[PDB]
Structures are given as C-alpha cells and as structure tokens.
Amino acid sequence: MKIEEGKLVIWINGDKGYNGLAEVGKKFEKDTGIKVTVEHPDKLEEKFPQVAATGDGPDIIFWAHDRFGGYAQSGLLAEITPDKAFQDKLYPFTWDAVRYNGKLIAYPIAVEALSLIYNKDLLPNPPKTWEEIPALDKELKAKGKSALMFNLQEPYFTWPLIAADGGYAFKYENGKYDIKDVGVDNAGAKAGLTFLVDLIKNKHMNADTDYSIAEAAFNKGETAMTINGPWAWSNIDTSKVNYGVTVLPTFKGQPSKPFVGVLSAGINAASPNKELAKEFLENYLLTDEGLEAVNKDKPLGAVALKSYEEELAKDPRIAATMENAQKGEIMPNIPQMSAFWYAVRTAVINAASGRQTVDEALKDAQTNSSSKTKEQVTNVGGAVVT
C-alpha cells in the first residue's frame, strides 16, 4: 500500500556495489517491465525499523544478518519461501545465519570478515602481532608515515582485538544465547581495549579517525596498514597502492576474532511486491551473472552461492577473508544485538577519546548489553498526550 505496488525499491549501504546492483535491476526491468530503484541512504539500518514500523520503507533491505532478528521480532521482515532446489544452491551455514525462530527471514548473499590490508611498498612483510605495531609506527613516523589507520567510530573494526584474548558478546549454550552471560567487561575485553587506548595515547592512532579518513590515508599511501572488508578492495585497486590482504595480527598470542556477517536481503513485511522481490532475488541476483555484476562493482567477499564462490575462491584475498572468518565467530542475530552494538560503540569511542577509562566504559557496556530490552519501534512523531 504505502510502498508502491508494481515496482521494487531496494536499500543497500553506500560502501557496497549499489551501481552493480542497479545494473541487475535494469535487466529485470527490461525483461519484466518492473522498475527497480536502488538507494543507499545514510544510516539505513537505523532508518529502516523506524519507517517500516509504519508500513513504509524499501521493498528489500540489504544488511548483515545480525540486525535481522530484531527486525523480524518487530514484524518488519517477511518469511521467505525458497524451495528445496533453491536452498541447495547456497551453503547451509549461510541459511543458518538468516534463520530466526525456525523461519528463514532473508536471502543470504555473501560472507564478510575483516582482514589486515597492507601497502607492500612500505611494508613487504606485515606484522604478525599487535604488540609490534607501536615500534613499527615509531620507525615510520620518523620518515613521515604511519603504521596503521582504521575506523575507530564503529565497534565492528575494534571488535577483533577486544575478542582476541577472551571478550565475547553473548554466551551460546544449548540452543540459546544467554543474554545474562555477556563477555564485554572480562579480562580479555579489558586487555584488548586497553591496548587500543594505549595506541591512541602514545600517538600511534587518532581517536577521531573514521572510515573516510582511514580509507583516504591508506589509498594515498600515507599509512602502511588498514583494517577493512572486501568491499574496500575496489577503491584500493583504483589507487596507486600495491596492496596485500592477510590474517589479522595476533594479540597475546591469540588470533584476532572478527565478528563475521552474512550480507543478506530481507523483504519488508509491508511490501505488496513480495512475489516480485522473490523473483528478483532468486532468479536475477542470486545467479552467477547477478553476483558478478555486483562483485565487479565492489567485492562481496565469499558469496553464499556455491557455483559462483567456486570462481571467486581463486584469489588469495578471499583465502585471507576465509582464514579470518574461521578464526572469528558468526554474529548472533538475536534482537539484543542492537543493544550490544550501541553499548560497545559507546565504550570504544568514550575510552578512545578519554571521556571514560577502559574499566568504566566496559562496565557500562556490560550492563546495557545484558539488559533484556523491551524494544519498541515507535517514536515521538506518533505520540499523543492522554
């Protein structure tokens, strides 16, 4: 109703291959007459639940699977209906990532994990440990370069270090995540965040560094290393930088443990075009030709579609992505994930900027993460005085 019948509107993050996705949309339109419009709103993962709560928003939303349990619990995502032959085309573990309360609530697209990206002309042998980074930066600074820059504003990028020596989100046991058993303020989490904060205090990193600042610096050759996902490789290809993609550094001898996302496509529960969305996703996007179009724009990572992953696997960068994914953990998709991420975002930004100590910051994050959230998608705009 509110979403227009007879067309598809799609939202996807602006760092992904939205132009390639639009090409698949234009093919669909040429074949079927059905217009497909791709948009990449800022903060789409916050906008979606707000507008979808009223029956508006896109027909299809692309995001990592971790947000989708919350959306489904709120009644905002449709159960999908792929048949067995279709399900056979994708890796079983990717279907598990989009299963919520026994139901499939999105189409898996690709497996995303962070890797260490390095400039082979500044650093032909990248460091195997976090511990050696301060000395490396000291050496490079004397010559007008830095060792490492990555996004310090989103906790996704610092999580691998927090988790390395023992940090965790929710304990999983016997078919359930226990929201009362959270691992954000244990000794391992404290050790990792303390190491990051010390890097900042010793002027090896800047607390204000964000995604754009880090990407620009790496791609200009000002910093020897960054931490990012497969989507970023396209812009580095364009840049003058000769780069490699490798395993994340260890911390206290333990592998960094990135939280692994499955980029997924959910169908708005209010869409009058659920059948059109199914046809588009199963018969146009999740094909070798469709994924190629998106992947050529911005790499997806290790795709869920078996036939195309076999092609993409011939690539040391994908081998590295998989190595890092296997050392980390697939994110939970439970509704509590939103609270978890907001809590850890606050702790990381506050500790990095010197607004809180590490102990103070993570104690707060532990409290909010483990608080069973009576969640609402209501807002002030619908409020009425009674």
Ligand SMILES: OC[C@H]1O[C@H](O[C@H]2[C@H](O)[C@@H](O)[C@@H](O)O[C@@H]2CO)[C@H](O)[C@@H](O)[C@@H]1O
């Ligand atoms: O930083 C917290 C943030 O992490 C994840 O978002 C990732 C996403 O998985 C990637 O596809 C890519 O877009 O980078 C994002 C971080 O900027 C979680 O998916 C998200 O819920 C969480 O807020």
